[PDB]
Amino acid sequence: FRGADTYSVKYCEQGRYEYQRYLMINRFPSEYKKHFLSFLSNIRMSSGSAT
Amino acid sequence: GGPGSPVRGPGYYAPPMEGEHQRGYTAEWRDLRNPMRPPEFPTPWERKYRQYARGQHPSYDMVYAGPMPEIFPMRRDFRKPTRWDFHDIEKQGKYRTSGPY
Amino acid sequence: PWWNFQTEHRQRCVLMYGGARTKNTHNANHRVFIKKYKRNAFPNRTRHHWAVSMTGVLSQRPRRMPWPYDLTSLIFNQPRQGSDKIGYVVGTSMLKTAVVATNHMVYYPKFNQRVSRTKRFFAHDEDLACVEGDL
Amino acid sequence: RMPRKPTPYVRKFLEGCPLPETLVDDIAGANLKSMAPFFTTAPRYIVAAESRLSKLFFHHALYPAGGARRPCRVLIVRGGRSVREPSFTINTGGGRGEVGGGSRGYRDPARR
Amino acid sequence: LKAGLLGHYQQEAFEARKRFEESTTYPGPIRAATPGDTRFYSGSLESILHDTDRHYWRAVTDDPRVQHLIPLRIRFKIFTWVTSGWEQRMQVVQIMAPKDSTIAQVKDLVLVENQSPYLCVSSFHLAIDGKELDPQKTLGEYGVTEQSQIDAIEQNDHLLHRDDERPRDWTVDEITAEDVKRSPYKEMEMQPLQNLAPRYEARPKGYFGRTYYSGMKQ
RNA sequence: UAAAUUAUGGUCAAUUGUUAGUAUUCAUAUUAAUUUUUUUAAAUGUUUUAUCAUUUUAUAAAGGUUUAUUUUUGAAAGAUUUUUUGUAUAAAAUUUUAGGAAUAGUUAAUAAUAAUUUAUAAUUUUGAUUAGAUUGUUUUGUUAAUGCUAUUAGAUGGGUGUGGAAAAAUAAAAAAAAUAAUUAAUAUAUAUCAAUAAUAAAUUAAAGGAUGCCAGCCGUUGCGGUAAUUUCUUAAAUAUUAUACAAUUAUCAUAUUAAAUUGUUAAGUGCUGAUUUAACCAAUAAAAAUAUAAAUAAUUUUUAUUUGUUUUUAAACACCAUA
RNA sequence: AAUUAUUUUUAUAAUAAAAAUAACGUGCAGUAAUUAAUAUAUUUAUAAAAAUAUAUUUUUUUUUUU
Structure with a gap:
């Protein structure tokens, strides 16, 4: 069953992250606020203890 | 397909579609x-792979190694429990017996 | 080779349930329906049952399913299915509330049909600005 | 849920007739719910089961739940005789520690 | 609604927008209004505690929270102990009073930055070069500016009636941070927050294992 | 009406087995079978602790019926700390019934936790409520097939209000706070006895039968004919219809229109149709967007036949002997 | 002497067991010298029948042909 089967050379000669297509993800403004605040808190987490 | 499936439309024909949906189902x-070609990359890097994105493998004289098919008796299922087959999840499941031979 | 989405689904099932993908269930079981009531005295007023009624939500024939390609998905990007709709105000008997009639599409592969259904939603307008007939 | 093979017929629901736990407890001598209304002078037979008899249940056997003034009965316990090994203190090892032997009541029958 | 008419309606809307942009021709410079807040956040309901009254990300600072204020300095008569004893000296407190505040309001503000347990303990009155100030007189009516030497004469009463009922950090936004150990004008307000824990994503969405076929997206 | 222009000055072809993929057997497959095997008899030792207590140990079954859900931060993970502040509760969408109708501890608003209030509220023929069936379930099977067909992941408002969370009366074991043990096929029954029954629960290896009949001169003597003779010694169900030739249950049911229908207040006529393919006048023939657009339609009407209505009540004619 | 393809009934200050029915009309069935057919409805005890009312249809050339 398909013992000898090959694929294009584009697959093996593509660069990294060439295939990613630009799609605009949409989310609610409440989601925007929630995620922005969460990311800001995570950035501001103080180092030393476990970070 | 619904939640987890990547499929977006029926395989061959569908109801009439409009605008971006028709454009996508038909072409994109x-x-x-x-x-002939694999799925197409975004604009800046489709051009530079245009001449790699044709055909499947450049050799059209491939000498088939491996086992020969059995034409009598013809078996229906080849499903056996195996200990070291890491591809069993794929070796299972019905597949179409249509190929070059 | 290229595999189906069924192969991906089988992989997921095997990983989560540990190899449990199916059981090869018997398919040709001979069912029978045994009638208990009289020929024309079934105990119901609207629908009378006299055969083997199958009770599938997505396992009933003829097949049908949501069709995500319609006006709403055509006219604006949504964060999530059914998040944003466009309809007509149908009733305003409730205070600070508008009843909006919205439509969606169901798909029947057997007949290759795209039939438009309708759904009614209680919306909210705090300042009583919606009148019946507003889009 | 439990797997069940489908069947086109009606399924039978057996209710069963097990051996009454109350009877097993009564013969073992370990029934703490029974109240005998009338006190009697007649031997009571009990069959020891896997060393389920103890001081707690034997106290009730002596003084039944009906309310008694004296052990006024003979109490036959088939089997139930125990044999106790001697006890000695191990001084070797990490420290002093008793070894009490044990009672081989149910484990060693009287006659093979 | 029939989707086939979307193209025709798009053409009609394009033409209507062009007619609007062409006929009325009455745009102009209009002051923008603060966007207020919305009650219709998505997801499940939120509790009372976290109802900070903003349900979207606004990266600007609108007018209502902006205040016009002047950095006044208030002098205090303090006595220091030198080898001889009780030498007289001077102590100052920085106060950020709004331009339109009254002298009584400025005094009440000074009551609030007096973290010192020794400085504002007895009733006092504000004065300029000895001339006492009317407590119901506006700063502009006295002409006082930051370059204005103003003294606080502490009458030797006691039991100064206080009301900490007004939080030190009270803006129109009605935020109430429990810690009132420093004024908002002194707090840096941008520093690492150690009272928390950074949490990574432990819930895979669609991809759990051996082969990333499609990732079961959505 | 464009009228046959002279370079014919370049002929010498095709085939070399090299692939842009649903392909159709009305009878072969497909099931219970020709090949169905294999076992299974309950009565039970989780643990540590400061000791008559306290700490750790949150989804067994049958029944009842199942929306289409769930990140208690709160326990643990877990750390230079600290919160029972680390946003878990939401929505969209897809169900069945030969005899098809009503539903309600009800909808929204609210200074109302815990509604003495206000409203022309809410569900439903686009098929609701109840009743019946009923876990869902592109995983099964079949086919040339977007057809048909099959299914066991779960969940659980009165048993302690404990707990971070009820998931709590059973536990093929996910090792559970000292390295119990860690090259073993053990995942043992061997936790071997004990009332108790194979009713029942699970599982598919590859270390000769049928089967009678008969008055003996006639009592219930119980003789015989008679060792009585004939019938018994791959198919059924079928998947593949994914099409309805065909007509003798048919399963019902848009009124056939400018050549037509209607006329009292409007025309014409003894009912216009005996003659005659032709019939005065009035009303009535077209008139939104869109052909792709997947509901762009209405839910009414009766010119035909019977029957009622009543009917000094038709004179008649024809049927009876009313109509 | 030619041409012809299942259901019903029933119970008391006592509360489901008894009875009966069913199974296309079809036997020794209908007046054949033989009496138009088809549809729909009304009636009458010859009812698997007949009568009445309406409608359509059946012509084989010497009437008609936009």
């Missing part, structure tokens, strides 16, 4: 069984 959606 991923068609992974295409034998």
Whole structure:
């Protein structure tokens, strides 16, 4: 069953992250606020203890 | 397909579609069984792979190694429990017996 | 080779349930329906049952399913299915509330049909600005 | 849920007739719910089961739940005789520690 | 609604927008209004505690929270102990009073930055070069500016009636941070927050294992 | 009406087995079978602790019926700390019934936790409520097939209000706070006895039968004919219809229109149709967007036949002997 | 002497067991010298029948042909 089967050379000669297509993800403004605040808190987490 | 499925439309024909949906179903959606070109990359890096994105493998004289098919008696299922087959999840499941031979 | 989405689904099932993908269930079981009531005295007023009624939500024939390609998905990007709709105000008997009639599409592969259904939603307008007939 | 093979017929629901736990407890001598209304002078037979008899249940056997003034009965316990090994203190090892032997009541029958 | 008419309606809307942009021709410079807040956040309901009254990300600072204020200095008569004893000296407190505040309001503000347990303990009155100030007189009516030497004469009463009922950090936004150990004008307000824990994503969405076929997206 | 322009000055073809993929057997497959095997008899030792207590140990079954859900931060993970502040509760969408109708501890608003209030509220023929069936379930099977067909992941408002969370009366074991043990096929029954029954629960290896009949001169003597003779010694169900030739249950049911229908207040006529393919006048023939657009339609009407209505009540004619 | 393809009934200050029915009309069935057919409805005890009312249809050339 398909013992000898090959694929294009584009697959093996593509660069990294060439295939990613630009799609605009949409989310609610409440989601925007929630995620922005969460990311800001995570950035501001103080180092030393476990970070 | 619904929640987890990547499939977006029926395989061959569908109801009439409009605008971007028709454009996508007709041209732009991923068609992974295409034998001439693979799915198409974004604009800046499709041009530079245009001449790698034809055909499947450049050799048209491939000498088939491996086992020969059995034409009598013809078996229906080849499903056996195996200990070291890491591809069993794929070796299972019905597949179409249509190929070059 | 290229595999189906069924192969991906089988992989997921095997990983989560540990190899449990199916059981090869018997398919040709000979069912029978045994009638208990009289020929024309079934105990119901609207629908009378006299055969083997199958009770599938997505396992009933003729097949049908949501069709995500319609006006709403055509006219604006949504964060999530059914998040944003466009309809007509149908009733305003409730205070600070508008009843909006919205439509969607169901798909029947057997007949290759795209039939438009309708759904009614209680919306909210705090300042009583919606009148019946507003889009 | 439990797997069940489908069947086109009606399924039978057996209710069963097990051996009454109350009877097993009564013969073992370990029934703490029974109240005998009338006190009697007649031997009571009990069959020891896997060393389920103890001081707690034997106290009730002596003084039944009906309310008694004296052990006024003979109490036959088939089997139930125990044999106790001697006890000695191990001084070797990490420290002093008793070894009490044990009672081989149910484990060693009287006659093979 | 029939989707086939979307193209025709798009053409009609394009033409209507062009007619609007062409006929009325009455745009102009209009002051923008603060966007207020919305009650219709998505997801499940939120509790009372976290109802900070903003349900979207606004990266600007609108007018209502902006205040016009002047950095006044208030002098205090303090006595220091030198080898001889009780030498007289001077102590100052920085106060950020709004331009339109009254002298009584400025005094009440000074009551609030007096973290010192020794400085504002007895009733006092504000004065300029000895001339006492009317407590119901506006700063502009006295002409006082930051370059204005103003003294606080502490009458030797006691039991100064206080009301900490007004939080030190009270803006129109009605935020109430429990810690009132420093004024908002002194707090840096931008520093690492150690009272928390960074949490990574432990819930895979669609991809759990051996082969990333499609990732079961959505 | 464009009228046959002279370079014919370049002929010498095709085939070399090299692939842009649903392909159709009305009878072969497909099931219970020709090949169905294999076992299974309950009565039970989780643990540590400061000791008559306290700490750790949150989804067994049958029944009842199942929306289409769930990140208690709160316990643990877990750390230079600290919160029972680390946003878990939401929505969209897809169900069945030969005899098809009503539903309600009800909808929204609210200074109302815990509604003495206000409203022309809410569900439903686009098929609701109840009743019946009923876990869902592109995984099964079949086919040339977007057809048909099959299914066991779960969940659980009165048993302690404990707990971070009820998931709590059973536990093929996910090792559970000292390295119990860690090259073993053990995942043992061997936790071997004990009332108790194979009713029942699970599982598919590859270390000769049928089967009678008969008055003996006639009592219930119980003789015989008679060792009585004939019938018994791959198919059924079928998947593949994914099409309805065909007509003798048919399964019902848009009124056939400018050549037509209607006329009292409007025309014409003894009912216009005996003659005659032709019939005065009035009303009535077209008139939104869109052909792709997947509901762009209405839910009414009766010119035909019977029957009622009543009917000094038709004179008649024809049927009876009313109509 | 030619041409012809299942259901019903029933119970008391006592509360489901008894009875009966069913199974296309079809036997020794209908007046054949033989009496138009088809549809729909009304009636009458010859009812698998007949009568009445309406409608359509059946012509084989010497009437008609936009």
